[model samples]
Target: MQGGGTHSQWNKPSKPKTNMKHMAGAAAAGAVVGGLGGYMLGSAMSRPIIHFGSDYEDRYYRENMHRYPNQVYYRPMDEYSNQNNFVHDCVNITIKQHTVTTTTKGENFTETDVKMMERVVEQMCITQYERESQAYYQRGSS
Candidate 1:
């Protein structure tokens, strides 16, 4: 029997093997594009447009600083006991008033004056006493 087969069948080439180098290059390219896209998007989002005065200063002054009278101290009435208790335990506040005068000069010695009244209030508290004397100490410091 003849062992030879058809030339086309015997000599036919096999399919090419997969190229790992091309796959790796393609993956690296995809990663670089993704990274650049993310960086650009983040930069666009983080850019600031307009800035005003400090948010903290604005809110604090708006809420606490203008034209409102200061608060008065309050405590339970039964805390007053000793002869010095009125000065010690009771809520004591001192109010003092003063007037300020200002003058302006113009042609022919014309005089303009402005007067302003100012009030100062002081309150007694444990914190103030502690600061004034070392006899009292904060809980942790003692």
Candidate 2:
């Protein structure tokens, strides 16, 4: 009667609902701050230190430098060089095929198998090319 009991009870003060817009903004700000902090911290941690007058520094150039042979090996063009080129092409194709197949199938191969495969392919190419070249030269000479 004094305060309209039931109506006043229903209209009583309650805890305010969370503002989603403000909460979302706060979360985005936190993420940006965390990301920037993590990047700065990670970069600081991973920077390399150069030590002068050390064995490592002295050996760096030799380790990184590309070495090329001074003398070029000569090969005759007729049959031997053709066989060499064929073997080289075979090796390249074998490597490409192995890489593609292994990658697609998620298969792992041993170092021994890899070395053996290359050698076998090289020998096969050489044998085939040698026979072909002999026949080719014999026909040409005749």
Candidate 3:
């Protein structure tokens, strides 16, 4: 009489290792590619960063060089979606040599304008990172 059922190796589940290594490699590659993309984008759009001051001299010189020199202020001819549009978020850019000052708000700049400015100045670049971070924090608290 057969006292016990036969144990077949083929019926047993295989160890959990076959595709794990491949999956891990793929994940690592994806992370590296993502990091590279981030760096590239950052470098491409890195400029327009500046400080703010309300004092007339500080305000005048630090905010308005993008347009004609000796101009106390400069407003774009293009109709912006908002009054505060700027290449960078609230950038107070001043140039003493040019004697121009202009206060710029992120709302003052369109995406196209910001992208164009980024090509010229390393610090002038403004992407969605800062805004997104602010949004994340605001949402998380709620």
Candidate 4:
């Protein structure tokens, strides 16, 4: 025999509300959403947001000026990048000096003219150094 037993289960879980209630719930929700959306949709489209650079540049120079026509293609310069290229071409100076084969030696009026050799080679090296560096900047920036 069971000892003073009263074995009962807890309350049962209930089902959801009727489909009509669900319909009412979604109806009010969609109504509020569509109400505000429809009311302001015209304004939303009326003043459409133009993209920053994409939209404006298309109209930047659409009209030609008869009185004064001025145009410029400008690009900004970077200091660190420029310095990088400046140092990048410094190796060319050494390359030019090492590959130098001048005929100034053993020529006419050649009185131990190593000084003239240094002057000429040094000038050429510096010239080529700056030339290559400037070209690098032009191509890189563009």
Candidate 5:
């Protein structure tokens, strides 16, 4: 019995004893440091309005420009966030609506005038006053 520091008793190597407590402690400590520090650093979410088809929006503006005195179209900026101080920042726009109807009464619309220009073209020339905006892509709006 006096032969100390020679050898130690052998036990199952796969068995757990106080090690379980250490594992729990590690997880607990990690939760503390990671809960706000690392977690906060790792987690954050935000977004801004996207312009995928912005070219199309710009194209519309160009067409209007070619036509003249129209408007400066800005693709809508909304949803996914922020305006003034608000998120999902959608600025709503409104406009007046009117219909340029052309009733081609062959009897009423007849004028043996120039060769031809077409009433449909004349009617089509009259259009709108409103430009709308959205978070996503759009259909002809400033």
Candidate 6:
């Protein structure tokens, strides 16, 4: 009987053959490649997560601006003038935590608004520090 081409069934090895060494080497190579690819993909995905809430810094600043007397009022040009001006400008404040975000815009705020502003500022500071720490650690690693 013809075996496929030049080699006949009779000429080929009768027993089934296995190359354990070559198989193991191929498997190791595949694992290394797969692991590297996975690591790269994971690193790429982690960056967006890390940067997710960075915008809240500006929000925290604006929200608490009125609470801090210094931030809300500035010294006049007159020498030792205690007169203050409320810097009322349309400001858009955006506070974010991970994937969650809250935005507030307008000029005036009540007592409760000031409290919420303080809370948002506190949360923003904590998260901002965490992000900065991570960046510093990564920079050190690099």
Best by lDDT: 2
Residue pairs with clashing backbones, model 6: none
Query: Scored by CA lDDT, what does every candidate get?
Result: 0.24, 0.39, 0.30, 0.29, 0.22, 0.30
Per-candidate RMSD vs. true structure? Answer: 36.0, 28.7, 25.1, 37.5, 32.0, 27.7
Ranking by lDDT: 2, 3, 6, 4, 1, 5
Tell me, by TM-score, which candidate is best. 2
Clashes of each: 0, 0, 25, 0, 2, 0
Estimate TM-scores for all models.
0.16, 0.38, 0.17, 0.24, 0.15, 0.25
**Which of the two candidates, 1 or 3, achieves a greater TM-score against the reference?**
3
lDDT of 1 at 49: 18
Against the true structure, candidate 4 has what lDDT? Answer: 0.29
Instruction: State the weakest 10-residue window (summed lDDT) of model 3.
Output: 30-39
lDDT of 4 by residue, 1-142 (tens): 2356776687476787553311223311221111111110000011111122333322332321111111111111223443333322322232223224232242231222332222333333334444545866687664
User: What local lDDT score does residue 40 receive in model 3, on the 0 to 100 scale?
Assistant: 19
Candidate 3 is scored at a TM of: 0.17
Q: What tens-digit string does per-residue lDDT give for candidate 1 at 1-142?
A: 2345645447567788663322223311221111111100000011111112345433433443332123223232223233133222222221111111111222121111000001111222233332323432343446
Q: TM-score: which is higher, 2 or 3? A: 2
- Model 3 per-residue lDDT tens digits across residues 6-80: 865576766665432122233112111111111212222323423222244234333433531211121232223
Q: After superposition, how far is residue 39 of candidate 4 from its true place, in Å?
A: 75
For model 6, how big is the CA root-mean-square deviation?
Answer: 27.7
Range of the 10 consecutive residues with the lowest summed lDDT in candidate 4: 36-45
